[PDB]
Symmetry: C2
Amino acid sequence: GDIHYRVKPVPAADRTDLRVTVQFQAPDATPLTVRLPEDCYGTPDLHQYVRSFQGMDGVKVSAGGDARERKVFPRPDGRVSLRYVLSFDPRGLDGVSFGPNVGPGHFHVAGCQWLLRLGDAEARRRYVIQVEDAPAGWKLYSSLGGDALRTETTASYEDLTSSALGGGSGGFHRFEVRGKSVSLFVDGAFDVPRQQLFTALERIITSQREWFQDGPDYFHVALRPRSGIIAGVALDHAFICFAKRESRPTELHLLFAHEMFHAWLPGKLRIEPPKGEPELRHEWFSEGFTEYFARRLLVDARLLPEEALAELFNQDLINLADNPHRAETYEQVVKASRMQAYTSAYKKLAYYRGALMALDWDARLRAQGSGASLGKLLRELHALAAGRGGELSEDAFFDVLAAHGLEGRGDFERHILRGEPITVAPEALGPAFVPRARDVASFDPGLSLEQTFKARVLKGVIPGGPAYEAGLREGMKWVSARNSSRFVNGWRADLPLEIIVERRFAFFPRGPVRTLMLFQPR
Amino acid sequence: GDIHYRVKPVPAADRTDLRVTVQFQAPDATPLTVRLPEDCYGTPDLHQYVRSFQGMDGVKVSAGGDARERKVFPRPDGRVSLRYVLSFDPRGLDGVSFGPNVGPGHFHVAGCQWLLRLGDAEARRRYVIQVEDAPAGWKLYSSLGGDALRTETTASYEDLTSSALGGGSGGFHRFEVRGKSVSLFVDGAFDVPRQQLFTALERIITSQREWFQEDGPDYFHVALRPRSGIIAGVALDHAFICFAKRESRPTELHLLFAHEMFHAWLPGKLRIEPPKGEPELRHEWFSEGFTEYFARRLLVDARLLPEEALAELFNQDLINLADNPHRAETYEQVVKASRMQAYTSAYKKLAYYRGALMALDWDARLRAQGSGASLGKLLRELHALAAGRGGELSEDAFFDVLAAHGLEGRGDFERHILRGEPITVAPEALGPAFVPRARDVASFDPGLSLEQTFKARVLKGVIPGGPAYEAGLREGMKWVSARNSSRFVNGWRADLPLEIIVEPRRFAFFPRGPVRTLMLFQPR
Ligand SMILES: [Zn+2]
Ligand SMILES: [Zn+2]
């Protein structure tokens, strides 16, 4: 059967409502049940935002089981025709990182956020989705087709939960890269001016499509506002970004350059782990290299100065040195995943490892003077993987590196399998930077952060350690803590660790100084 | 004493909050009562939008009598230091035509809408108001100074109730006219692109300044802000705020801009003074009607309005005036109606139609003399002479000027205004490209006395055989509502039926009455 969808954006005082009308053929006139959209992206109770839900041209609608269900009575011939208005709260949805994002001059909804749940979700149907009566001056962008006025998709409901439909009037830019269309949309309040976001996004995409040398016929980049986060979801033909108003240019550039890079690496260049081995085996490559490339992309596009590039790798060396699993072998990392004690530190371990390995490999390849580079080698690796569905066996991947005079297999077995420390060549950041010894204080809170949190009572306070030195003593009524998680994205080294007891205590996590070769300028 | 204000615009999900910190000295340490802002522009219970209200640097606050009050505990020396956050609901405030206008990337507040009520409202103080930690890329404005970052005014609270403070991030344009600064701000959803709005506003504003060729204010702001179902504007010294709907057409705004902002000059600096005892409405035909004429001439000169659309506006005037029940009413009768609070839309609109057609006639007659005369040249002379008497001309001086240029102004005034005689427009008044031709226009006749009907709650005055009678309406039906019923309010469409829901059935018909012949201008 065919499902016809018509969506109208109706701008309001504080939001943009979506008037949705849908028509399809049922088998006969037996009253069937339909369900209101449930958010796969985390909003609790998405049905509360359905303002009205009535039938059209004779189709009757009554109450169903709960408030997420409706009983509709099809026509004798089987036609079903319904109309419902989605009025999403902009205030409530500011806390749902990937929920619906609406505003007085824009709207964005993922497939699950506006589509109706009818029947089997695995069943395939022909979806015709149109945007009608769009306001004057607005630009639209759908993930199912290059012309959001009408898309034609044959897929299942499940497939369509990740799709996107949106529009706005706050910033639009269009350009062509290799004859293919790319559309940029920016709505919401943002410190970075619209022109700087369009230029930066234009450069990042143009660089990405140059690397791998013709792609998608249509692609959209939608920037939408949400406080307290800088996140993005990637899709086929679209990249959606929910970011806070106070986002710095580099913060958005690093995210744009990293999440869009995931469409190639590991999207079209995946290293197949051996039989039975987990997907995390090659996280150093599928995540650490992507970040390295993302950094190399910004510096090439003249968006990130080389001095900041040095501090990004310096942070990788400092963060990996403070990682408690920095020396853990494959057998230990894989055992923690089967044992589910896999904290933020474990999540970040392969990012720090893989980024520095790529920096070393590039330096080692470019020192050859034969015009080689980690990038030239990744283009060969990706072109070869095209004849195998974008995947490469472990032997085929390391065979290529060995052909370019690079000991790829030895590095992986050393640093990833055996957990041996990673050495970065000194010429990696150009001749203007040189690694010089520096002492960085290790992260020692002076108390067991987890045993305390578990028992809600200060436990294991090491006498003479930082926590002891602040006055804290073991067995104390732990109330709360702030800036104590070392490997979550917002940890700051210049800010003290706060801990509240029954009284607020603050101290820096001072510990045995270690020496690291950080990159300095000349 | 000195009152010192600090305002922080804090963007939010659906609005922009205002963190206001105020510092002033009390006469003593004895507790005093301060009351939250009340809206002079019509917002019920504006205090409900005050989220927090606390003391600062040792000053204590407590509850007071009602929700509008607060008990402030000054310091021993008398120092009072308060901080309160205004978080205005953009949804409910869309219904208040002149209430606070906020939203995700902008804010606008009138003086009364953010300032605190401290002591006597007519006591003069020195108000120093600064906008701090404003968001990056936002542009701000104030009516108390050309630099919104810090203004300084010695005025009373009452004077400051009509002041304006605002900013935004959805559109800004600045330009200079004869060395003076003008800034334009646009926020909210609007069908007309920002470039079109800025170009038109710059053209209209420049045209108005060259018309009188006087040095305008050192700073001037024009703030376009969103609000459903209305197209309104409030004129202030140093600022013109406009709250309009998203679907506003360009000409609708162009007429609003050109008309409202001309009132700075006419009657602002050129008022005809009525004789002793006479109401100020006597010259509403000159202070409103002629302003509408010059606003239309202004738009055509700036190429924002074609000449075909100018003819229609005057055709509209002829039709609207012919439908006006008070069209032939003398001045004593129209002055009798103001004293009995009967001024309705028909009355407030009578002087608009009257004065605009007279201005059109007067211009044709002046230019027919072939001596380079024109109504615009005449108004330049009148404005210049008025500058020596305070923007004010006696009736004798005003009319002496017109009679000097061969125009019998006085005669028309005591024939069309004072006596209510019908107004004749010279056929050549719209140029050789247009000709007045007789057209038959159906008179407005609901077949029912609306005014009477709305005064009671039943149907009053249904004429057996009128349009309302044939539609099915009768004498004595519980009257509930009406749509498209006010003929002289801006929104009446002769092409949409008159809707009257009685009892509860809905009667929709056309208020078509006896035919009328009028000479409308048509293209050749
Ligand atoms: Zn990633
Ligand atoms: Zn007026």
